Structure formats: C-alpha cells, structure tokens
Amino acid sequence: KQIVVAGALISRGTLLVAQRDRPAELAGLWELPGGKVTPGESDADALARELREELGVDVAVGERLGADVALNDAMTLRAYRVTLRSGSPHPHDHRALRWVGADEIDGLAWVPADRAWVPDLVAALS
Ligand SMILES: Cc1c[n+]([C@H]2C[C@H](O)[C@@H](COP(=O)(O)O)O2)cnc1N
Numbered sequence: 843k844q845i846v847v848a849g850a851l852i853s854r855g856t857l858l859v860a861q862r863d864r865p866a867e868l869a870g871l872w873e874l875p876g877g878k879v880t881p882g883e884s885d886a887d888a889l890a891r892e893l894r895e896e897l898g899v900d901v902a903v904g905e906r907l908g909a910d911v912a913l914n915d916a917m918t919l920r921a922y923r924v925t926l927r928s929g930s931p932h933p934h935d936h937r938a939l940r941w942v943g944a945d946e947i948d949g950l951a952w953v954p955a956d957r958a959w960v961p962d963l964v965a966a967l968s
C-alpha cells in the first residue's frame with residue numbers, strides 16, 4: 843500500500859487545518875495537510891517536504907496522531923504530530939487555512955478519510 847502522510851500542526855494551543863481545493867469531491871473540505879511518500883523517503887522526510895511545499899513552513903515530525911486510515915486497497919493515510927521550526931503557514935496549495943481549538947474540531951467539514959481522527963485531535967487539544 844502506498845503511504846500518504848498528514849500533519850497535525852499544533853501551535854500556541856491551536857491546530858492547523860487546511861481546506862482542500864481539489865479534486866471536486868474534496869474541494870471545500872478540510873484536512874490535515876500532507877501527501878504521498880516517494881519511494882526511498884522516510885515518513886518524516888515526505889511530510890516535512892509536503893508541508894514546506896504546501897504551507898511554506900519548516901516542521902519537525904513527531905509521534906503518530908491516531909491510527910492508519912484506509913483510503914483504498916492501494917493507499918494508507920497516516921497522521922503525525924508536527925511542530926513549527928520556522929515560517930508561518932500560507933495556503934499555497936489550499937483554498938484556506940484555519941487555526942482551530944478543541945471545541946471546533948468536530949464541527950468542521952472534514953474530508954471523510956480524515957474525519958476518523960476527530961477524537962484523537964480533540965484529545966490532543968484537551
Ligand atoms: C493529505 C491527505 C490526502 N488525502 C488523500 C487525497 C488523495 O486521494 C490522496 C493524496 O493526497 P494529495 O491529493 O496528494 O494531497 O490522499 C486525504 N487526507 C489527507 N489529509
């Protein structure tokens with residue numbers, strides 16, 4: 843299974859969430875940003891690559907956040923905690939970004955795959 847890595851960036855007590863712009867089925871819905879791992883890459887290398895590209899930030903990749911999610915037969919989604927080293931997030935590849943607190947998490951229009959992490963994200967912001 844191809845791995846997709848996603849980042850739960852928590853900064854000053856809030857969580858970054860990113861509103862997708864593609865494809866049509868996901869455009870308008872919110873995610874933990876990330877992307878596919880390239881063969882040869884560690885999860886950490888891939889996720890730091892994706893978040894530099896998409897958000898314009900340098901992050902450190904930490905512990906897992908929640909469990910693996912099955913996208914399809916081919917693909918598995920994995921979330922990690924990440925923390926900021928340098929830079930401020932900007933939506934280079936998204937419709938919008940939003941910093942949310944615990945009480946906002948379950949109200950967001952999540953990408954259905956990511957919605958699985960809602961209890962984990964609420965816990966992390968407890
Ligand atoms: C980063 C991410 C990605 N995906 C799904 C959407 C695509 O089917 C696939 C690859 O992601 P992308 O379109 O490269 O961001 O994984 C779902 N949740 C996420 N948090």
Ligand SMILES: [Mg+2]
Pocket residue numbers: 875876877892896
């Ligand atoms: Mg992406």
